């Protein structure tokens, strides 16, 4: 059971990492660029998650 | 307005262990029952404590600022009234001055002609008055960067009780250009000891300053060579850049904390996370 | 069988846009009219707070020559509220103007203003040829020619200590590799593009680490309760439904994450209330069927 309930933790901290993008909240990038120089931001968070 | 004072008991300095002390909430949003694990400046634990006394004897010299300082002070009738920062405290480069009347504590951030020996007169008058007309802090304010009146606080100024029940702690982070106050105040019966036990440190109040600090000198009431204070202590501890685990509770108080640096016990429970071990 | 397809979700319902109380507008006018402006090395500062801005008046406006808004697009810019606001004031020749940039190189750009990787703000620059020009040289502005260490992003560089040039002691009022830290620039109408000079004005910020004051249209309608609806408390915005909890705050707590990252239960602006966030219903619809062949 540890193990298991060990990988959903490891998995669900990832949402909360830059991947090298300026933040880690879709929302976030979403109302605070325009949008053609949203997708170069976004498409590092996507490959990384 | 400036008299020299040297009516001190020249001592060197005591020492003291830091047991489990300066812990403050290090963000403004708030969590519960969950351990975090974060970096930032703080008081390592177990480190030695400058100590100074106050009653004869007069402990006020000045001492460096570098990256926090924390002061904490036990007292009765709280003789101490202020502080002092800045570089060279002579009119030259901005200079901090928090005075805390008996009214309430004006912050004024503005450049300021000190003395050599500065203090708060307020007069040794023993006819139940203590009547101030010695503004014995600087002479001149040539221009203010800053101005602040906080709330009207009148806290006690007398009493020779047994056991110092007043225990007030300080921390004075300056980074980012922005200047820090957390503190919290307890009750104590004890006589002697820098009290061992846990604690928190709640905020007060953030400032816009952006001015450069590497000394400072605390400030209190008092004639120059004559008077009647009664028994004050003082510690002073330097920070240092650590890591930790903070154990929030339900209540969302910050209950305890586990350093990450301190001996390799503590390191595994850095790394593992949690409080206990097993073999 | 039984096949998963197509997940199903509820939908909102509502906006709710509850901002903080209105106060008076920004007095950011005239800092970008004042008097003087003082010169490149100890550049102006100002602070904003306490105060509503909106940037339609001085975005729109053709008042401005150059404009770039770096970590925020300007056409929305109005729809974030900012912790604080720093107002940089100060005049260059309009030769360095590209040097402002982050990470940019430059006797400006390197020895009297730097600015990091990350600087979140925008900034504006803006001919001032007509009257910042002397007809006998607008000498008031100096800069610091040299520098004995490049300085970190936003610290002013104040002394007017006489150059090192060489290991050779420097000595006297001048002396031998010995020059002043400071030279001073010449403004006539006599200028072309690039040497006349330039009103340039940067407007920095910093996000959430405590209730942000600067905001624009408010527009706060109301605290419904248990409806999908999409919140917009300050500026983080979401969806979900808005319930009370038992839960409890210190003076100084909004923003509770509360397990990991998510932003759960939360005040409020406009008053004081301890809400509660959590997103609406959702699940995975499937198809149990039989054989098509069979029956439909
Ligand atoms: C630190 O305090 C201990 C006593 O607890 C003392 O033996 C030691 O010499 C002190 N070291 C310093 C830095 O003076
Ligand atoms: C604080 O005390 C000093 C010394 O008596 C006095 O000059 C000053 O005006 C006082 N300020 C307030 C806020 O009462
Ligand atoms: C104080 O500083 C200001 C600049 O902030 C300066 O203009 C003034 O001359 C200084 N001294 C006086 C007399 O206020
Ligand atoms: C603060 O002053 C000290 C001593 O003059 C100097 O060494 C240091 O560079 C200064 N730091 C800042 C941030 O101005
Ligand atoms: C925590 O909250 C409970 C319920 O309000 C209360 O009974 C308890 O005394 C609180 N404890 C602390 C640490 O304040
Ligand atoms: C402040 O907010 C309250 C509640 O929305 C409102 O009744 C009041 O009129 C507001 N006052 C100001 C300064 O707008
Ligand atoms: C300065 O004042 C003029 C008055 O015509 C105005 O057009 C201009 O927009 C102002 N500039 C700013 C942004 O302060
Ligand atoms: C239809 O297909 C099922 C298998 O999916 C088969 O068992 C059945 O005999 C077929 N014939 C009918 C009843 O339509």
Redesign the interface.
């Known amino acids: 059971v540890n193990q298991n309930a060990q990988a959903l933790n490891t998995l669900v901290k990832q949402l909360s990492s830059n991947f090298g993008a300026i933040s880690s909240v879709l929302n976030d990038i979403l109302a605070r660029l325009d949008k053609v120089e949203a997708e170069v931001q976004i498409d590092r968070l996507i490959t990384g998650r | 307005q400036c008299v020299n004072l040297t009516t001190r008991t020249q001592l060197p300095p005591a020492y003291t262990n830091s047991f489990t002390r300066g812990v403050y909430y290090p ?6 029952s ?1 351990l975090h694990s974060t970096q930032d400046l703080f008081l390592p634990f177990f480190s030695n404590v400058t100590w100074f006394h106050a009653i004869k004897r007069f402990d006020n010299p000045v001492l460096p600022f570098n990256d926090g300082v924390y002061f904490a002070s036990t007292e009765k009738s709280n003789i101490i009234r202020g502080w002092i920062f800045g570089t060279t405290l002579d009119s030259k480069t901005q200079s901090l001055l928090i005075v805390n009347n008996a009214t309430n504590v004006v912050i004024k951030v503005c450049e300021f002609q000190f003395c050599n020996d500065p203090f708060l007169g307020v007069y040794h008058k023993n006819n139940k008055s203590w009547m101030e007309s010695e503004f014995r802090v600087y002479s001149s304010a040539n221009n203010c960067t800053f101005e602040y009146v906080s709330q009207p606080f009148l806290m006690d100024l007398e009493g020779k009780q047994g056991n110092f029940k007043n225990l007030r702690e300080f921390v004075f982070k300056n980074i980012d250009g922005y200047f820090k106050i957390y503190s919290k105040h307890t009750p104590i019966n004890l006589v002697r000891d820098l009290p061992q036990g846990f604690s928190a440190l ?2 007060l109040v ?1 400032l ?1 300053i ?1 001015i450069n600090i590497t000394r400072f000198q605390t400030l209190l009431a008092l004639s120059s060579s004559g008077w009647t204070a009664g028994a004050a202590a003082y510690y002073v501890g330097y920070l240092q850049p650590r890591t930790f685990l903070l154990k929030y509770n339900e ?2 108080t910050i209950t305890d904390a586990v350093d990450c640096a301190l001996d390799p016990l503590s390191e595994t429970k850095c790394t593992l996370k949690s409080f206990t071990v097993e073999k | 069988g039984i096949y998963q397809t197509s997940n199903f979700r509820v939908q909102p319902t509502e906006s709710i846009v509850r901002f903080p109380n209105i106060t008076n507008l920004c007095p950011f006018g005239e800092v970008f009219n004042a008097t003087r402006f003082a010169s490149v090395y100890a550049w102006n500062r100002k602070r904003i707070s306490n105060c509503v801005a909106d940037y339609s008046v001085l975005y729109n406006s053709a008042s401005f020559s150059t404009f770039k808004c770096y970590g925020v697009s300007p056409t929305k810019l109005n729809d974030l509220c900012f912790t604080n606001v720093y107002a940089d004031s100060f005049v260059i020749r309009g030769d360095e103007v590209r040097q402002i940039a982050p990470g940019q190189t430059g006797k400006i750009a390197d020895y009297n203003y730097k600015l990091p990787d990350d600087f979140t703000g925008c900034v504006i620059a803006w001919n001032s040829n007509n009257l910042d020009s002397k007809v006998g040289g607008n000498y008031n502005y100096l800069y610091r020619l040299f520098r004995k260490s490049n300085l970190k992003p936003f610290e002013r560089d104040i002394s007017t200590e006489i150059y090192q040039a060489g290991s050779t002691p420097c000595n006297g009022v001048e002396g031998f590799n010995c020059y002043f830290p400071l030279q001073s620039y010449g403004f006539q109408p006599t200028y072309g593009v690039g040497y006349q000079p330039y009103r340039v004005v940067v407007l920095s910020f910093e996000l959430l680490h405590a209730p942000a004051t600067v905001c624009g249209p408010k527009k706060s309608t109301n605290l419904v309760k248990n409806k999908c609806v999409n919140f917009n408390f300050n500026g983080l915005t979401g969806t979900g439904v808005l319930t009370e909890s038992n839960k409890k705050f210190l003076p100084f707590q909004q923003f509770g994450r509360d397990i990991d990252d998510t932003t759960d239960a939360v005040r409020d602006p406009q008053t004081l209330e301890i809400l509660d966030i959590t997103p609406c219903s959702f699940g995975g619809v499937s198809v149990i069927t039989p054989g098509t062949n069979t029956s439909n």
């Open positions: 963000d403004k949003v708030f969590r519960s969950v709640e905020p953030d816009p952006g209540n969302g």
